[PDB]
């Protein structure tokens, strides 16, 4: 109920810890013409399912800096040949280096990349924002628009769904089978009621 992503009704908690899922929680059952059939998830004779840790899914700062230097040297070269051939980087040449550098290559393709070029002293201003807003900013050190998004949780959420037994394993814990929806595909939540 905690680590299930918010799209499936869970709280979408991020775990920087060691949590074991009991194997009794990885069992479900479905009814078909031949009757009721029961399924598990851990076919391999391994231990109980362990939820992915937000530990492993963050690249360390040193590797991040090495990647940034390598990627920006590569981009400098690519731009140098792009100017010579009277062409521009078409978002396909910069495919191997997309979310790598400290100023993420994402930022070069940002729609408002011209107005942000006139934004100076933005890190100092973001740090000093604590004296104007009554809420502490965890990302006081960086700006998403200027510095890019320096992390990704796609792999984390993918492995969290895989570790919980997928949609079938997760939804056996829920009232989804009580709704008698034929499938989970064409479904959407409503965060707030009409009233």
């Amino acid at each position: 109920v905690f680590y299930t992503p918010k799209e499936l009704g869970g709280l979408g908690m991020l775990s920087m810890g060691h949590v074991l899922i009991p194997q009794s929680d990885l069992r479900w059952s479905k009814q078909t013409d031949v009757g009721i059939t029961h399924f598990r998830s851990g076919m391999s004779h391994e231990e109980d399912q362990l939820i992915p840790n937000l530990y492993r899914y963050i690249q360390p700062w040193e590797s991040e800096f090495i990647d940034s230097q390598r990627v920006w040297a590569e981009y400098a070269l690519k731009r140098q040949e792009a100017i010579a051939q009277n062409r521009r980087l078409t978002l396909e040449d910069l495919e191997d280096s997309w979310d790598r550098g400290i100023p993420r290559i994402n930022t070069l393709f940002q729609k408002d990349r011209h107005t942000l070029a006139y934004d100076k002293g933005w890190r100092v201003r973001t740090d000093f924002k604590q004296y104007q807003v009554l809420k502490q900013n965890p990302f006081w050190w960086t700006h998403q628009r200027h510095d890019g998004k320096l992390w990704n949780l796609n792999n984390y959420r993918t492995d969290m769904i895989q570790a919980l037994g997928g949609v079938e394993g997760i939804l056996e814990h829920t009232l989804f089978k009580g709704t008698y929806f034929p499938t989970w595909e064409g479904l959407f939540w409503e965060k707030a009621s009409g009233f």
Binding site: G17, V19, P22, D48, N53, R56, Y57, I58, N155, D159
Partner: peptide, 22 residues
């Protein structure tokens, strides 16, 4: 089975932090 978040001080220390990241 308790579901309690156990500290990983000394647990899962074999693996690096670059694992399972792309």
């Amino acid at each position: 089975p308790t579901g309690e978040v156990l500290s990983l001080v000394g647990k899962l220390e074999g693996t690096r932090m670059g694992d399972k990241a792309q």
